[PDB]
RNA sequence: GGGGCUCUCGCUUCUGGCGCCAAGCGCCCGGCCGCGCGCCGGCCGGGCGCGACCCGCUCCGGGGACAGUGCCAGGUGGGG
RNA sequence: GCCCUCGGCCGAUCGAAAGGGAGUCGGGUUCAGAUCCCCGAAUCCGGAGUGGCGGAGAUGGGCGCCGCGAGGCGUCCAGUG
């Protein structure tokens, strides 16, 4: 509410604890549910990657 | 070769906490229970409705201390009248006095208990 | 031999995004309490800043061998405790009633403690050796002592541990002690100590007085400079032929 | 053969799975039965290390003697 | 009692008789009270340490024997439906 951009709810794995982390990214246009996004230095150049 | 901090947070270590061992009691003696049995039960109710409770519902109606709860009323009636009671209903009157409807056990008759009390 | 085939290795992989990281040591990255961070940053500041020679002179202390010999000598003239003094007083009282009131045993030589006591001994030139702790809480209590001691010609050393000096004087901490007088049999031991002290503290006082401390950068900064100078060294290597 | 030498001093991208509380190895310490010759046979337990490299002085990064703050000086200031 | 290991609602506390929030209904009864009293049918939550009773788990196969058979005994192997 109050924001024109849709938000994306993305779930990662915590690398140090057995747990799931939920982020609230700003949705880039074209991304869909059930899609894999990759965040990091070695991430490839695709829509939605960070 | 075994001191390893596997967490990046420092927490306050748990130190010994001793129980109090006072060198003198702060009060010389424990003050006595003011809400004893004779304080709990003040006087029975002898009104028209109270009389109807005795004959019909096997219930003795009392005016009790406003601080006493149902457990204290139950034990107080049992001790100073030597009767068994089933349940205690309790309201507070508009004038501020607490009123207790003390139903007696089936083998106790509220009529002759009120007779030996002296409120018949 | 009788090895169970059911037994097998389960080698887990700690690559990025693979199996969860093990519980390894994280002391290097702990959020320490404020008092721990404060006393660690204080140590780093004493390395960053240019420490004046009056304060930096106390970072030069006696080595392990010489400090051990010095405290070995000082243990013999350790001051009497309360129970030792009370026993001596009781013995004097019982002796006096029987037939005494004299024989003060010359007040046998003892170690004089305290900065106020020691500085008056140095001014009167009645001190033969002065031992100063290197870690006085306000350094103002001692920064005048090395310069005063040489001005009066009294040999002075800096030892590590104000708690070590305190342990001699049966207290938690002593700022400085002094050998005023020594027994005849220990005169040779004191002379060997004093000569070793003079060559290291009194004789090179002009170097001590002009020796600034600190002014050392951190290992990360030093490494950045080192790889820059190494890169420029290769640049000059190609510059020449 | 292979060192000064450059990236690597890496282990995860076609799937809307799963993933922690160590396997393995080495070194020991208790108790049991016993070859009753000790590294000695086996059985119940407990511990440490490598697995998971070493060292170090700022947690990591970005600014930085500027910004900022305190005091004075000049300007502007119907916002009051 | 102490030691090892594990433990971020990461923030006290207050804030709704219309929000969220387990589980009570029928009949009778008073001058004035009743889903609260009486009668009769339920139901929720909590407790049960020495364990209240049942039922489940869980009670089957193989081999050696006795026994006309039925059925019994010994050994071994299973069995968190
Ligand atoms: Mg009530
Ligand atoms: Mg005006
Ligand atoms: Mg917390
Ligand atoms: Mg509240
Ligand atoms: Mg409500
Ligand atoms: Mg009404």
Swiss-Prot record, chain A:
Name the chain's protein.
Answer: Large ribosomal subunit protein uL2
Q: What is stated as this protein's family in its record?
A: Belongs to the universal ribosomal protein uL2 family.
Tell me which species this is from: Homo sapiens (Human)
- How does it associate, per the subunit comment? Component of the large ribosomal subunit. Interacts with CRY1.
Instruction: Specify the domain of life of the species encoding this protein.
Output: Eukaryota
Provide the function of this protein.
Component of the large ribosomal subunit. The ribosome is a large ribonucleoprotein complex responsible for the synthesis of proteins in the cell.
Anything else of interest in the record?
A: This protein can be partially incorporated into E.coli polysomes in vivo, indicating it can replace the endogenous protein.
Locations listed in the record: Cytoplasm
What post-translational events are described?
A: The modification is impaired by hypoxia.
From Swiss-Prot, chain B:
Where does it live in the cell?
A: Cytoplasm; Nucleus
What processing steps or modifications follow its translation? N-terminus is methylated by METTL11A/NTM1.
Q: Which residues carry this modification: Phosphothreonine?
A: 9
Asked if the Swiss-Prot or TrEMBL record annotates the protein with the keyword Lyase, the reply is no
Keyword set, alphabetical order: Acetylation, Citrullination, Cytoplasm, Isopeptide bond, Methylation, Nucleus, Phosphoprotein, Ribonucleoprotein, Ribosomal protein, RNA-binding, rRNA-binding, Ubl conjugation
Location of N6-acetyllysine modifications = 34
Q: Which residues carry this modification: Citrulline?
A: 5
Q: What does this protein do?
A: Component of the large ribosomal subunit. The ribosome is a large ribonucleoprotein complex responsible for the synthesis of proteins in the cell. Binds a specific region on the 26S rRNA. May promote p53/TP53 degradation possibly through the stimulation of MDM2-mediated TP53 polyubiquitination.
Its family?
Answer: Belongs to the universal ribosomal protein uL23 family.
Quote the subunit structure annotation: Component of the large ribosomal subunit. Interacts with LYAR and GNL2. Interacts with MDM2; this interaction may promote MDM2-mediated p53/TP53 polyubiquitination. Directly interacts (via BIB domain) with IPO5, IPO7, KPNB1 and TNPO1; these interactions are involved in RPL23A nuclear import for the assembly of ribosomal subunits. Interacts with IPO8.
Q: What protein does this entry describe?
A: Large ribosomal subunit protein uL23
Its source organism is Homo sapiens
Record lineage:
Eukaryota, Metazoa, Chordata, Craniata, Vertebrata
UniProtKB/Swiss-Prot annotation, chain C:
Q: Residues where N6-acetyllysine occurs?
A: 9, 72, 192
GO biological process per UniProt: cytoplasmic translation; maturation of LSU-rRNA; translation
Q: Which keywords appear in this protein's UniProt record, sorted alphabetically? A: Acetylation, Chromosomal rearrangement, Cytoplasm, Isopeptide bond, Ribonucleoprotein, Ribosomal protein, Ubl conjugation
Q: At which residues is the cross-link Glycyl lysine isopeptide (Lys-Gly) (interchain with G-Cter in SUMO2) found?
A: 23, 72, 100, 220
Q: Where does it localize?
A: Cytoplasm
InterPro entries membership: eL8/uL1-like (IPR050257), Ribosomal_eL30-like_sf (IPR029064), Ribosomal_eL8-like_CS (IPR004037), Ribosomal_eL8/eL30/eS12/Gad45 (IPR004038), Ribosomal_eL8/Nhp2 (IPR018492), Ribosomal_eL8_euk (IPR001921)
Q: Which residues cross the membrane?
A: none
Q: Which PROSITE patterns match?
A: RIBOSOMAL_L7AE
Q: Which domain of life is it from?
A: Eukaryota
Q: Which GO terms describe its molecular function?
A: cadherin binding; RNA binding; structural constituent of ribosome
Query: Which Pfam families did the record assign?
Result: Ribosomal_L7Ae
* Main localisation: cytoplasm
- Gene Ontology CC: one annotated term: nucleus
Per the record's keyword annotation, is Glycoprotein included, yes or no? no
Q: How does it assemble?
A: Component of the large ribosomal subunit. Interacts with CRY1. Interacts with DICER1, AGO2, TARBP2, MOV10 and EIF6; they form a large RNA-induced silencing complex (RISC).
Disease per record is:
Chromosomal recombination involving RPL7A activates the receptor kinase domain of the TRK oncogene.
Q: What does this protein do?
A: Component of the large ribosomal subunit. The ribosome is a large ribonucleoprotein complex responsible for the synthesis of proteins in the cell.
User: What's the family?
Assistant: Belongs to the eukaryotic ribosomal protein eL8 family.
Q: What is this protein called?
A: Large ribosomal subunit protein eL8
Species of provenance? Homo sapiens
Taxonomically, what lineage is the organism?
Answer: Eukaryota, Metazoa, Chordata, Craniata, Vertebrata
| Gene name of the encoded protein | RPL7A
